[PDB]
């Protein structure tokens, strides 16, 4: 278990390189530029290709093209840049092209406060594209998690063949300190690669799979010729407009994601035994919560639990419902006007307390203690 | 490639774009009326004997319907001024094959 001193963006780049990413493409924008800087020096190390395009649309298009032929690629942006990629993301969802998109959240709306921190890109990435879309999105909340979460995002993108968002934060991105990461052997052993059809003849069935598994795509220039497109495609990939196939394709796309729910989402639950209140929250805000709960032990007759989801989408509604039914007081802490509170309220079929702040500053966990007094 | 023929078309594909008959130096094709199909006019070869190695017709068919026999296994005729006169006369009739051509079903 090697330990190193670094910051969030360096750790994200190192995890991406060590997982096996060999392609990058994007546009420079504060504060998601350090990842590009690290990749531009770390990709020639291993023979990878780095290229800075003229905008973000090309930045994601080149990554999609590179990963369509069988190369592990990634892209990184922040705020407005992500707003320019939503056209291609849906394509990556429909053609089933793996991709990892890092998003260092900053102060929305449009440009506003480019040097501040906010969590306003949650409901945006819940359903960013037009039409139907099932979203998978992680949420690092510590320096030690900027590595393992990136590894998990790459593994999920390879296993499900769907784009995966990494909701990195400015506070996590720019904090500098000492971290512990798993050894190289463990990381290389747990790596997951996409499936290949070694069989004879030709693939001929890239999308001819069951109702709960993704597509099998072979690398280009290898003998198996198939046609990929963003239209509703049949077993081979040619566009179609039949009612049965069109309605079955989207159902399969949803079911392949909503069936692996036992392994897709994790969550950290602490002090959930005998707790009177819960301080359910996600992301870098948890870094404040874990501090405040360390000081509220001084005289509190009541015990406060904490339930932090690790994968924002799809939400853990099954556990949320039981948590809401079991406990009486629920507290939600966020860094926006309550856009993830809507999902928590839809679950539990209940109304819960909220504590938001969207001025571009942190929480300062003294405020958490002041709110716990009620 | 049928034996004994130089240029032949496929009636199941040809649409009647008036392009193949507009490039023949000898004018051996003509668009005859065929009411069985949608467009109504289909290309019919009229003078296969006067076919020249100018593959232009197959080069000007965006539909994959007309084919011309190769030089090795077939012999093509020579260029005569009568062929050019016939081509220009057929062209000057809105690419429709002239009536007298049907004197022998050509």
């Amino acid at each position: 278990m090697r330990e190193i001193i670094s910051d969030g963006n360096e750790l994200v780049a190192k995890a991406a390189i060590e997982v096996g990413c060999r392609f990058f493409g994007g546009y420079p924008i504060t504060p998601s530029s350090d990842i590009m800087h690290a990749m531009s020096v770390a990709l020639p190390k291993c023979g990878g290709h780095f290229i800075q395009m003229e905008d973000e649309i090309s930045g994601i298009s080149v990554s999609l093209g590179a990963s369509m032929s069988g190369t592990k690629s990634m892209t990184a942006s922040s705020g407005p840049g992500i707003s320019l990629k939503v056209e291609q993301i849906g394509y990556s969802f429909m053609a089933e092209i793996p991709l990892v998109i890092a998003d260092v959240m900053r102060s929305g709306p449009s440009t506003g406060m480019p040097t501040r921190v906010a969590q306003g890109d949650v409901n945006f990435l819940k359903h960013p594209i037009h039409g139907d879309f099932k979203a998978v999105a992680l949420a690092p909340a510590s320096l030690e998690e900027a590595y393992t979460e990136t590894v998990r995002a790459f593994n999920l993108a390879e296993m499900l063949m769907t784009p995966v968002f990494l909701l990195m934060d400015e506070t996590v991105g720019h904090m500098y300190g000492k971290v512990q990461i798993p050894d190289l052997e463990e990381v290389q052993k747990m790596t997951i690669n996409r499936k290949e059809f070694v069989g004879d003849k030709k693939d001929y069935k890239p999308y001819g799979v069951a109702q709960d598994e993704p597509a099998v795509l072979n690398p280009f220039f290898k003998g198996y010729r198939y046609h990929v497109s963003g239209l509703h495609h049949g077993p081979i990939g040619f566009p179609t407009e039949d009612a049965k196939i069109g309605g079955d394709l989207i159902d399969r796309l949803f079911h392949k994601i909503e069936s692996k729910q036992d392994i897709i989402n994790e969550n950290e639950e602490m002090d959930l035994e005998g707790a009177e209140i819960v301080i359910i929250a996600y992301g870098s805000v948890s870094l404040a919560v874990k501090e405040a709960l360390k000081d509220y032990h001084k005289e509190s007759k009541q015990k406060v639990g904490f339930f932090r989801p690790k994968t924002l989408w799809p939400s853990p509604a099954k556990r949320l419902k039981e948590i809401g039914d079991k406990y009486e007081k629920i507290l939600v802490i966020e860094l926006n006007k309550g856009q993830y509170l809507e999902e928590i309220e839809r679950a539990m079929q209940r109304k819960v307390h909220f504590f938001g702040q969207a001025n571009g500053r942190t929480i300062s966990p003294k405020q958490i203690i002041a709110k716990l007094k009620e | 490639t049928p034996d004994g023929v130089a240029v032949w078309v496929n009636e199941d594909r040809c649409k009647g774009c008036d392009i193949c008959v507009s490039v023949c130096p000898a004018g051996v094709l003509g668009m005859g009326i065929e009411k069985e199909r949608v467009l109504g006019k289909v290309a019919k070869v009229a003078y296969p004997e006067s076919c020249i190695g100018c593959v232009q017709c197959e080069l000007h068919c965006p539909d994959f319907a007309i084919y011309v026999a190769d030089r090795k296994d077939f012999k093509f005729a020579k260029v005569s001024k009568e062929a050019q006169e016939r081509s220009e006369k057929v062209k000057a009739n809105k690419y429709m094959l002239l009536e007298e051509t049907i004197l022998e079903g050509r």
């Binding site: 392609f23 493409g25 020639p44 190390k45 023979g47 290709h49 290229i51 395009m53 003229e54 905008d55 649309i57 090309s58 298009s61 080149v62 990554s63 999609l64 093209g65 590179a66 369509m68 032929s69 069988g70 190369t71 056209e87 291609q88 394509y91 280009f220 220039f221 290898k222 003998g223 010729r225 198939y226 046609h227 990929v228 497109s229 963003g230 239209l231 040619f238 566009p239 | 490639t1 594909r13 649409k15 009647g16 774009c17 008036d18 392009i19 507009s22 467009l39 197959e58 080069l59 000007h60 068919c61 965006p62 539909d63 994959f64 084919y67 011309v68 190769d70 690419y95």
Partner: protein, 273 residues
């Protein structure tokens, strides 16, 4: 390649589907013949094309075909080419494509000199979406969005690509497939960004409302508007209106490939330093 066009095609999609006589099958035949002439094996060629009226070409050839979104074909092709910098990639797109909306992609690909084979199928209008106005549409014509005469001026794809920094610029047309195939043969073997401007015809959306409803009239109009490079160079500046030189226009020889330079960057970057 020859009378046997079915070896390089998918039998399940023929016949074509464009209108009845659109000048798009000729381009396909020329591409097939040229790709066979060089001796290229079809297991190495990737054909990427965007959405529109010319994207259907991606659904007929029997190879690794990619159908991209609007105007992003060049970026996907660049990603594919740098992913595997040893295989041949051909891009096919229309006027409403990367020379209308994705202009930045084409200009920057020309600037950085990546080994692509961009082919523009020019029909002067938006064929699929019922005859809108294009940047290459001549002024004073009738379009559904300009019912009194187009006022926007004309882009010059050859001049713009030359200004951007393309390494091989050539123009041809469907009026003569032999010279088009020869130009494609000369340009495919190059080792830089090759631009092929091809003049096509759209008689269903352009000629219907501009007294050119027949394919023959549009073809003869395009023939009249097109002259050879030497003949065009032999004219007076006033006479050079609505004229376009034909053939290979620029074939500069001493340029450095982007991949050939990134190879040196890789070698001298962290190859033991």
């Amino acid at each position: 390649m020859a009378f046997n066009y079915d070896e390089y095609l998918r039998v399940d999609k023929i016949p074509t589907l464009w209108c009845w006589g659109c000048g798009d099958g000729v381009i396909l035949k020329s591409i097939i013949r040229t790709i066979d002439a060089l001796g290229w094996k079809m297991d190495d060629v990737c054909l990427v094309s965007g959405i529109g009226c010319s994207g259907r070409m991606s659904s007929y050839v029997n190879c690794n075909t990619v159908h991209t979104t609007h105007g992003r074909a060049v970026a996907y092709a660049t990603g594919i080419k740098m992913a595997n910098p040893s295989k041949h990639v051909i891009v096919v797109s229309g006027d409403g494509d990367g020379f209308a909306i994705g202009g930045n992609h084409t200009m920057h690909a020309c600037r950085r000199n990546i080994d692509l084979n961009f082919i523009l199928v020019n029909n002067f209008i938006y064929g699929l979406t019922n005859s809108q106005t294009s940047p290459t549409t001549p002024n004073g014509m009738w379009t559904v969005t300009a019912q009194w005469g187009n006022i926007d001026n004309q882009f010059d794809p050859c001049a713009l690509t030359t200004a951007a920094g393309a390494s091989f610029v050539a123009r041809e047309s469907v009026l003569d497939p032999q010279k088009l195939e020869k130009v494609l043969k000369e340009g495919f073997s190059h080792k830089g960004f090759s631009f092929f401007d091809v003049h096509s015809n759209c008689h269903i959306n352009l000629g219907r409302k501009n007294k050119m409803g027949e394919a023959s009239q549009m073809l003869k109009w395009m023939e009249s508007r097109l002259v050879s490079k030497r003949q065009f160079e032999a004219m007076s500046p006033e006479e050079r209106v609505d004229k376009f030189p034909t053939g290979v226009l620029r074939h500069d020889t001493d340029r450095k490939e982007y991949c050939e330079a990134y190879q040196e960057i890789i070698e001298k970057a962290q190859g033991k330093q």
